[PDB]
Paper text:
Mitochondrial proteins CHCHD10 and CHCHD2 are mutated in rare cases of heritable FTD, ALS and PD and aggregate in tissues affected by these diseases. Here, we demonstrate that the low complexity N-terminal domains of both D10 and D2, as well as the full-length proteins, can form amyloid fibrils in vitro and in vivo. Structures of D10 and D2 fibrils assembled in vitro from the low complexity N-terminal domains of each protein show that their core comprises the most highly conserved region between the two proteins. For D10 and D2, the central conserved VAV motif forms a beta-strand that is associated with the protofilament interface in all the structures we have observed, suggesting that it may be a critical element in fibril formation and may be expected to appear in ex vivo structures as well.
Numerous pathogenic D10 variants have been reported, including the first mutation to be identified, p.S59L1. To assess this, we solved the structure of S59L D10-NT fibrils to 3.06 Å resolution. As expected, residue L59 in this structure flips away from the tightly packed position of S59 in the PF interior. This results in a different PF fold and packing arrangement. Interestingly, S59L fibrils are no longer symmetric, with each PF adopting a different fold. S59L PF-A adopts a fold similar to the WT PF1, except that the beta-helix connecting strands 1 and 3 is disrupted by the flipping of residue 59. S59L PF-B, however, adopts a completely different fold, likely driven by the fact that the WT arrangement could not be maintained with the bulky L59 at the PF interface. The S59L mutation resulted in greatly enhanced D10-NT aggregation rates, as measured by ThT fluorescence. Furthermore, NMR spectra of this mutant prepared freshly in solution exhibited dramatic signal loss in the region corresponding to the fibril core, suggesting that intermolecular interactions are greatly enhanced for this mutant, consistent with its faster aggregation rates. For S59L D10-NT, we obtained two 2D classes that closely resemble those observed in the sample that led to the S59L D10-NT structure, with similar populations.
Residue numbers in the entry:
A (entry chain E), B (entry chain C), C (entry chain A): 43 to 75
D (entry chain B), E (entry chain D), F (entry chain F): 44 to 74
The structure:
């Protein structure tokens, strides 16, 4: 599906998030009434 | 499907997000009533 | 499908997002009532 | 080769379905 | 090769379904 | 190779469904 790879020799701040898959999920950034 | 690769010798701030796949998901950035 | 590759010798801020594929998903940036 | 780089990124939005984004930038280089 | 880099990132939003993002940037390099 | 890097990250938001993000950045490099 996806062979992701991050390779950093020198990283001041290394942030990495991996999600296997998203199925039937409603993702909303900002919501207002 | 996708052979992604990020290679940085020197990164001040390295941010990497990997999602295997999105299936049947309603993604909305900004929502207003 | 896609052999993506990002190669930076020196990056102040390195941001990389990889998605395997999007199937049957309604993606909306800005939504208004 | 040699390169003096000064970058100022503000309000950077990365990702699928990016919503409202606002940004104000100002440069006073080589002054 | 040799590179003097100065980066200033503020308000960086990364991810799916990014909402309201605001940012103000200013550069006074080489002054 | 040789590289002098100075990064200043503030208000970095990483993840799915990122909401309100604000950021102010300023650079005074090479002055």
């Amino acid at each position: 599906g996806l062979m992701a790879q991050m390779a950093t020799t020198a990283a001041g701040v290394a942030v990495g998030l991996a999600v296997g898959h998203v199925m039937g999920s409603a993702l909303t950034g900002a919501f207002s009434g």
